[PDB]
Amino acid sequence: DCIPKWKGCVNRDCCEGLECWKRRRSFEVCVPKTP
């Protein structure tokens, strides 16, 4: 099942349009695909 924007992607499965990105000060999460 896809993972929505804003949700923690740890151990990953993002919903359509998003890439799972590791943030500087905290755990990775799914967010909008970027140029």
Binding site: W6, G8, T34
Partner: protein, 406 residues
């Protein structure tokens, strides 16, 4: 007709250049040209900058209860999906027995809380932190710092000029004529870090930002560190620089919003975005909208706000302001305490020697000179100027026009 030809040669040459140059200088005004006028002026009075400083620890553990540890607990990484302490849990000898008496969820009865009041109560307290404060040799006190919420927590802005108070001025350069503060960063009330999250941090100390009062802090982005166990002199040079609206320049002079600021536009751009994408506003953000929750934070607010400022640059275009003040700074540190005054201050504030070296810092902000400098964009060619070069001779040419038709 040699001389007869010359007579008309230079006569027809006159009107050649005349209109030639004339339209040239007319064209140069169409480019709406400017010039940057740099000036160093030494006054006897400087208006002292607003000074905001946040502690790096968002809340005191001394001040957190069973209640807040429920909702908030998992946001500070002190808790599991299961409301429990991870195998990654690393914490002090005494904290165990004191953490769990507050951590017992057997027969648990919850009660409401909001992160605005949470920050308010659990956030660090300037009454506590501030051991001494002097501006220009007149003893100040906690009364003089308005509270501003930032992404750090409860924060404090000196020389606010806000709530319609006055803005302080300085009569002289050097130390005695600036602000000198002495803090206990209060490490003992620092929360434990059992893992990485936006509300938890590896560094101990404060962050400062020096702004015009007209400009709100973004201490997250624009601030500069100060460590404990150091006196730190920060010696400033006021540089004030100006821009023009188009056609000349790109700036926007807007009080439409009080006064326009990059940090200013930069902030509501997070406000609009956080609200919209999270259906909530974050505590240090303005507006009438709802506050977020620990669940809201973790799952929307926090991450969304991170993507905003770091990743996606197509959203916020914040136009270049015309009137802008900047303070150039020079920092230096010295050990405090001296090994000689250690025991004096271990007495005076009633902590251990070893404590003093960790928790005590002294911040000195001042101006090196009373001089301050300016960089101004001025209009190079103005309507008056074109009428000053072409116009006068264009009226003169239009004069010899009639005498000719005869």
């Amino acid at each position: 007709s040699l001389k007869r030809v010359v007579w008309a040669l230079c006569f027809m040459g006159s009107l050649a250049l005349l209109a030639l140059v004339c339209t040239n200088r007319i064209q140069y005004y169409f480019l709406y040209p400017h010039v940057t006028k740099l000036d160093e002026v030494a006054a006897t009075r400087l208006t002292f900058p607003a000074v905001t400083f946040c502690n790096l620890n968002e809340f005191r553990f001394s001040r957190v209860t069973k209640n807040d540890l429920y909702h908030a607990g998992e946001l500070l990484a002190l808790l599991n999906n299961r409301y429990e302490i991870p195998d990654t849990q690393t914490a002090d000898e005494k904290q165990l027995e004191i953490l769990q008496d507050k951590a017992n969820f057997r027969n648990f009865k919850p009660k409401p809380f909001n992160m605005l009041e949470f920050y308010d109560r659990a956030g660090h307290d300037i009454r506590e932190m501030l051991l001494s404060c002097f501006f220009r040799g007149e003893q100040c006190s906690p009364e003089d710092f308005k509270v501003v919420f930032t992404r750090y927590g409860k924060c404090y802005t000196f020389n606010a000029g806000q709530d319609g108070k006055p803005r302080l001025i300085t009569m002289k350069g050097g130390t005695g004529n600036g602000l000198e503060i002495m803090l206990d960063i209060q490490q003992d009330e620092y929360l434990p870090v059992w893992g990485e999250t936006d509300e938890t941090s590896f560094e101990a100390g404060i962050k400062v930002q020096i702004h015009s009062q007209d400009e709100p802090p973004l201490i997250d982005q624009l601030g500069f560190g100060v460590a404990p166990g150091f006196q730190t002199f920060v010696s400033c040079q006021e540089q004030r620089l100006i821009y023009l609206p188009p056609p000349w320049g790109d700036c926007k002079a807007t009080t439409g919003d009080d006064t326009y600021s990059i940090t200013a536009c930069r902030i509501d751009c997070e406000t609009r975005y956080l609200v919209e994408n999270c259906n909530c506003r974050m505590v240090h953000m303005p507006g009438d909208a709802p506050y977020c929750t620990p669940e809201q934070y973790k799952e929307c607010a926090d991450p969304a706000l991170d993507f905003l400022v770091e990743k996606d640059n197509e959203y916020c275009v914040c136009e270049m302001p015309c009137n802008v003040t900047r303070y150039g700074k020079e920092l230096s540190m010295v050990k405090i305490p001296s090994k000689a005054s250690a025991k004096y201050l271990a007495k005076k504030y009633n902590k251990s020697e070893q404590y003093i070296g960790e928790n005590i810092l002294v911040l000195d902000i001042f101006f090196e000179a009373l001089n301050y400098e300016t960089i101004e964009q001025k209009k190079a060619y103005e309507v008056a100027g074109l009428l000053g070069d072409i116009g006068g001779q264009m009226g003169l040419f239009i004069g010899a026009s009639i005498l000719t038709v005869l």
